[PDB]
Amino acid sequence: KRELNGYVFISEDWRLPALGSSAVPLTSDFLNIIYSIDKEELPKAVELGVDSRTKTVKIFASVDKLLSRHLAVLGSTGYGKSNFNALLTRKVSEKYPNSRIVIFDINGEYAQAFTGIPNVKHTILEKKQQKGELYSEEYYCYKKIPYQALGFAGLIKLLRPSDKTQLPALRNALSAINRTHFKSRNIYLEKDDGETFLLYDDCRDTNQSKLAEWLDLLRRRRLKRTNVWPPFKSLATLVAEFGCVAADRSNGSKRDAFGFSNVLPLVKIIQQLAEDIRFKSIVNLNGGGELADGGTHWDKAMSDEVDYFFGKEKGQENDWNVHIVNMKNLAQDHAPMLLSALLEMFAEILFRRGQERSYPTVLLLEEAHHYLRDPYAEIDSQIKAYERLAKEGRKFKCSLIVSTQRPSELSPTVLAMCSNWFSLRLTNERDLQALRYAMESGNEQILKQISGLPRGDAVAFGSAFNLPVRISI
Amino acid sequence: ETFLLYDDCRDTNQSKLAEWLDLLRRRRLKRTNVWPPFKSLATLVAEFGCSKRDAFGFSNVLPLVKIIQQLAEDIRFKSIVNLNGGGELADGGTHWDKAMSDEVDYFFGKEKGQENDWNVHIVNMKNLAQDHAPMLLSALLEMFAEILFRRGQERSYPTVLLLEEAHHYLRYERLAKEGRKFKCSLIVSTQRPSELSPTVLAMCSNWFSLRLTNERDLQALRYAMESGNEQILKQISGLPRGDAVAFGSAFNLPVRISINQARPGPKSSDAVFSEEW
């Protein structure tokens, strides 16, 4: 209808046309009027593309409500999905140079087209340029992660003890890591008064009538602290030591073969995992760190790495705006177990940070089905972690962008939290059926159209768009 | 005389534990007056699961002790529920009864015939994680039902209960079937009616349906409707904002009305990522 100011469109379907009325099609001006957006969204809008039917009208979307909730992109990789993601990220970056975006890459394609943007870094798993300088190739730094961040629960999960009394032995061993004195091959210390404490390396029966009280005073925690982080082999020796000793009734010792028989799988798996090339190249197992007093050392060993990957809080200056994490030298076996461990820690840090200080964040995880779902197990531990991360993501300032190619393999609960959908061509039936089951703002016509979309054509529907439309880009 | 207990299957003082457990089961020991810490269950299970503590029967109870010790040091879980104890214990066998009754009386009001203070209660749970809401909320509802049964018909008081976003934890069902008998009412709010059990939608007598779009959700509504026709279900697929269709025992004929605005409204706080950039 025409008002004193201009043309306004109203969404209601309770009025019907009169009998005998003539019908005419619509021109470019009417499409412009219909597909427009409110005036208050003009400063917050971004160009996205043009419709594939008429190629005459430009369609804009409010960033605030597009990224306030979660977002998901579905399609086939290599047919324009990567181009769409790169274009969306690049267009987001240009409007606000002071925006923070983190990208978890799988193959080295997303870093190629991001050149010419201030505050761009790289990571593969030296020379640093000044602030404001653009980005070119051959400016890639190197880094890796040590095992101090995995934590008590992380080591428990990786070792997966599932027999006998292995669990209590591991708990006792891991409770005595801050008080392990290590040298080239000698683990011993003299006392302050003058008494000398010694340990042996041979696995033989020697003066074990006092080894029980040695471990007793170790558990009592009245022994000297340490200032260097012990190497990875320390836990193997510690777990081997426990369970082979016993307390005799009077002046004796016992070498129980059953205890060593029960313990041997742990040392076997530890030594098998220690010797590796595809794994040993990511985990810094050497140790040689620095400790802290007070007994609270676990928190910082994770906080520092969370800060390194994702940045600092408000009020503390940061130098990077876009941080692509390019990973290629990771075997397909260890990806779901290592990558999924990087998100629970981020969720915990987000909880600890609180509402008082927080910074807007955009995350662009790619190939979700590779690490969100373990392909050689049925345990849904990753499901709980992901859903807790998503739940905390809306309470605080965070937003995810899921990007997969085989929607059937994804858990059906994953698509529940998303609010907007971008879809490409799909050449299967199971993926379409999965899409229809767990979607919102549906329409049968677009669902039929998406079966035979050509190259470069995508559909969009959600809370941001008032009327679903197909765009070309 | 005192005897100690450990966890790591220690081969220490394995001579007289059998008579200790025999006397414990025979109920001839001394009773305490303080609540033990929650972590003691791990040691109790370790002791009861094995004149020598064999390691073959211990393997049969590994998952239970593992889970109970895993939940012990989880920071999120212990921020909502107490795990320290230290309370008064009465004399007899009614110690659980008061422990449930006092908390239930605190939460869901007091018994009729006694003075009360509040008339409207708002329970705010934003710090509770989504991985733990079902268990705690279902436990609270079960406690409420169990306390309701033994209070009696003549001692009950009317109560209206609102349950927002109810499909997570209503998915045991004593409340929905005894609410009428024990003078209690429920209001259900859910944006996905399919997840709700098919037997809970039948007891409702009035319906206030806003706009729905998914095809599966609308089919579940047709299955359990009892006071409506197919002529009005077509309007739901295109209802504008603020409009609703109502039908039930309180309406002579189905109607399509536009709801008013409440002043003051609720806190619709929404995060803005453009002002801070």
DSSP string, A242-296: TTS----SSS-----HHHHHHHHHHHHHHHHHHS-SSSTTTEETT---B--GGG-
Q: Determine the 3-state secondary structure of A451 from DSSP.
A: helix
Cβ-based neighbour number of residue A360 at 10 Å: 21
Phi, psi of B161 (to 5 degrees): -120, 125
Phi, psi of A251 (to 5 degrees): 55, 70
Q: Which two tokens stand for residue B53?
A: 């503590």
Q: Which two tokens stand for residue B43?
A: 């040691």
Q: Which two tokens stand for residue B95?
A: 């110690």
Q: Which spans in A176-226 are helix H?
A: 211-220
Interatomic CA distance for residues A385 and A379, integer angstroms: 12
Residue A117 near residue A93, CB atoms below 8 Å: yes
**Residues of B whose CB is below 8 A from A164:** 55, 58-59
Distance set, CA B254 to CA A32, B230, B232, B245 (Å): 39, 11, 8, 7
Q: Determine the 3-state secondary structure of A72 from DSSP.
A: strand
Residue in chain B nearest A170 by alpha carbon: B8
CA dihedral (B48, B50, B51, B53) positive or negative: negative
Question: Cβ contact (<8 Å) for A440 and B214?
Answer: yes
User: Minimal CA–CA distance to A111: which of A123, A99, A100?
Assistant: A123
- The residues facing B208 across adjacent strands are B246
Q: Which spans in A49-120 are helix H?
A: 63-68, 81-95
The answer for residues whose C-beta is within 8 angstroms of residue A126's C-beta and 6 or more apart is: A141, A142
User: Minimal CA–CA distance to A447: which of A471, A465, A468, A416?
Assistant: A468
Q: Which two tokens stand for residue A275?
A: 């010797």
Residue A80 near residue A456, CB atoms below 8 Å: yes
A456–chain B nearest CA distance, Å: 28
C-alpha A325: how far from chain center? 11
In eight-state DSSP terms, residue A120 is B
Pair type for strands A145-146 and A141-142: unpaired
Q: Which two tokens stand for residue A128?
A: 């640093």
A129–chain B nearest CA distance, Å: 24
The answer for residues whose C-beta is within 8 angstroms of residue B232's C-beta and 6 or more apart is: B245, B247, B254, B256
Phi, psi of A107 (to 5 degrees): -125, 150
Taking each helix axis from N to C terminus, what angle separates B95-107 and B133-151, rounded to the nearest 10 degrees? 100
Query: CB-based burial of residue A125 (10 Å sphere; 0-12 exposed, 13-18 middle, 19+ buried)?
Result: middle
Residue in chain A nearest B238 by alpha carbon: A13
User: Minimal CA–CA distance to A433: which of A419, A415, A420, A418?
Assistant: A415
Q: Which two tokens stand for residue B62?
A: 């590994």
A26–chain B nearest CA distance, Å: 23
* 3-state helix/strand/coil string of chain B: CCCCCCCCCCCCCCCCHHHHHHHHHHCCCCCCCCCCCCCHHHHHHHHHCCCCCCCCCHHHHHHHHHHHHHCCCCCCHHHCCCCCCCCCCCCCCCHHHHHHHHHHHHHCCCCCCCCCCCCCCCCCCCCCCCCCHHHHHHHHHHHHHHHHHHHCCCCCCCCEEEECCCCCCCCCCHHHHHCCCCCCEEEECCCCHHHCCCCCCCCCCEEEECCCCCHHHHHHHHHHCCCCCCCCHHHHHHCCCCEEEEEECCCCCCEEEECCCCCCCCCCCCCCCCCCC
User: Minimal CA–CA distance to B144: which of B116, B96, B103?
Assistant: B103
Residue B62 near residue A167, CB atoms below 8 Å: yes
Interatomic CA distance for residues A246 and A258, integer angstroms: 12
- The residues facing A50 across adjacent strands are A58, A472
B130 vs A44, A67, A391: nearest CB: A391
- The residues facing A101 across adjacent strands are A322, A362
Interatomic CA distance for residues B250 and B245, integer angstroms: 13
Query: CB-based burial of residue B38 (10 Å sphere; 0-12 exposed, 13-18 middle, 19+ buried)?
Result: middle
Cα-Cα-Cα-Cα torsion A418, A424, A426, A431, nearest 10 degrees, comes to 0
User: Minimal CA–CA distance to A83: which of A71, A91, A72?
Assistant: A91
Q: Which of B7, B56, B273, B275 to mutate to test the interface with A (most CBs of A within 10 A)?
A: B273
B53–chain A nearest CA distance, Å: 12
User: Minimal CA–CA distance to A179: which of A214, A245, A230, A213?
Assistant: A230
H or E segment to which residue A34 belongs: helix A28-35
End-to-end CA distance of chain A: 32
Q: Which two tokens stand for residue A183?
A: 């040298």
Q: Could you give the strand order of the β-sheet that contains A362-363, starting from the edge strand earlier in sequence?
A: A322-325, A101-104, A362-363
Site of tokens 């609720």: B266
Interatomic CA distance for residues A163 and A170, integer angstroms: 12
In eight-state DSSP terms, residue A75 is S
Q: Which two tokens stand for residue B135?
A: 């268990």
Residue A459 near residue A423, CB atoms below 8 Å: yes
The answer for residues whose C-beta is within 8 angstroms of residue B8's C-beta and 6 or more apart is: A165, A168, A169, A172
The answer for residues whose C-beta is within 8 angstroms of residue B144's C-beta and 6 or more apart is: B104, B107, B108, B175
Site of tokens 């820690």: A345
Instruction: Determine contact: A297 vs chain B, CB below 8 A.
Output: no
Distance set, CA A284 to CA A74, A177, A325 (Å): 36, 17, 18
Site of tokens 């009950």: B156
Interatomic CA distance for residues B81 and B83, integer angstroms: 7
Cβ-based neighbour number of residue A371 at 10 Å: 22
Interatomic CA distance for residues B188 and B161, integer angstroms: 9
Residue A178 near residue A226, CB atoms below 8 Å: yes
Interatomic CA distance for residues B132 and A324, integer angstroms: 34
B214 vs A153, A165, A442: nearest CB: A442
End-to-end CA distance of chain B: 70
In eight-state DSSP terms, residue A62 is E
User: Minimal CA–CA distance to A124: which of A284, A278, A330?
Assistant: A330
Pair type for strands A71-74 and A401-404: parallel
Site of tokens 């193997």: A236
CB-facing half-sphere around the CA of B155: CA atoms within 13 A:
10
Interatomic CA distance for residues A223 and A180, integer angstroms: 10
Q: Which two tokens stand for residue A207?
A: 């003066």
Distance set, CA A128 to CA A17, B28, B216 (Å): 68, 76, 56
In eight-state DSSP terms, residue A7 is B
CB-facing half-sphere around the CA of B79: CA atoms within 13 A:
11
Interatomic CA distance for residues A254 and A239, integer angstroms: 18
Way it was determined: cryo-EM
Q: Identify the contact set of chain B against chain A, taking CB-CB distances under 8 A.
A: 7-9, 11-12, 55, 58-59, 62, 65-66, 70, 76, 126, 129-131, 213-216, 238, 240, 270-274, 276-277
Question: Cβ contact (<8 Å) for B59 and A164?
Answer: yes
Chain breaks in chain A (C to N over 2.5 A) after: 125
Interatomic CA distance for residues A172 and B101, integer angstroms: 40
Question: Cβ contact (<8 Å) for A441 and B130?
Answer: no
Q: Which two tokens stand for residue A285?
A: 């197992």
Interatomic CA distance for residues A278 and A201, integer angstroms: 31
Residue A287 near residue A231, CB atoms below 8 Å: yes
Length in residues, chain B: 277
C-alpha A110: how far from chain center? 17
Phi, psi of A141 (to 5 degrees): -95, 170
The region that residue B224 occupies, defined by phi over 0 for left and psi between -120 and 50 for alpha, beta otherwise, is alpha
Q: Using only C-alpha atoms, what is the Rg of chain B? A: 26
Cβ-based neighbour number of residue A345 at 10 Å: 19
The answer for residues whose C-beta is within 8 angstroms of residue A342's C-beta and 6 or more apart is: A309
Whether omega for the bond prior to residue A168 falls within 30 degrees of 0, making it cis, is: no
Interatomic CA distance for residues B236 and A270, integer angstroms: 61
Question: Cβ contact (<8 Å) for A68 and B126?
Answer: no
Site of tokens 């010792």: A253
Q: Which two tokens stand for residue B32?
A: 């305490």
- The residues facing A402 across adjacent strands are A72
Instruction: Determine contact: A358 vs chain B, CB below 8 A.
Output: no
User: Minimal CA–CA distance to B25: which of B8, B9, B47?
Assistant: B47
**Residues of B whose CB is below 8 A from A360:** 273, 276-277
Question: Cβ contact (<8 Å) for B8 and A359?
Answer: no
Residue A244 near residue A259, CB atoms below 8 Å: yes
Interatomic CA distance for residues B163 and A334, integer angstroms: 43
Cβ-based neighbour number of residue A153 at 10 Å: 13
CA dihedral (B63, B68, B73, B77) positive or negative: positive
Interatomic CA distance for residues A101 and A48, integer angstroms: 19
Phi, psi of A263 (to 5 degrees): -80, -25
The answer for residues whose C-beta is within 8 angstroms of residue B262's C-beta and 6 or more apart is: none
The answer for residues whose C-beta is within 8 angstroms of residue A425's C-beta and 6 or more apart is: A75, A76, A79, A450, A452, A453, A454, A455, A457
The answer for residues whose C-beta is within 8 angstroms of residue B99's C-beta and 6 or more apart is: B87
Interatomic CA distance for residues A72 and A464, integer angstroms: 13
**Residues of B whose CB is below 8 A from A321:** none
The region that residue A332 occupies, defined by phi over 0 for left and psi between -120 and 50 for alpha, beta otherwise, is alpha
Interatomic CA distance for residues B183 and B5, integer angstroms: 50
Question: Cβ contact (<8 Å) for B7 and A441?
Answer: no
Residue A118 near residue A98, CB atoms below 8 Å: no
B58 vs A64, A165, A439: nearest CB: A165
Interatomic CA distance for residues B31 and B90, integer angstroms: 11
Q: Which two tokens stand for residue A245?
A: 């000793």
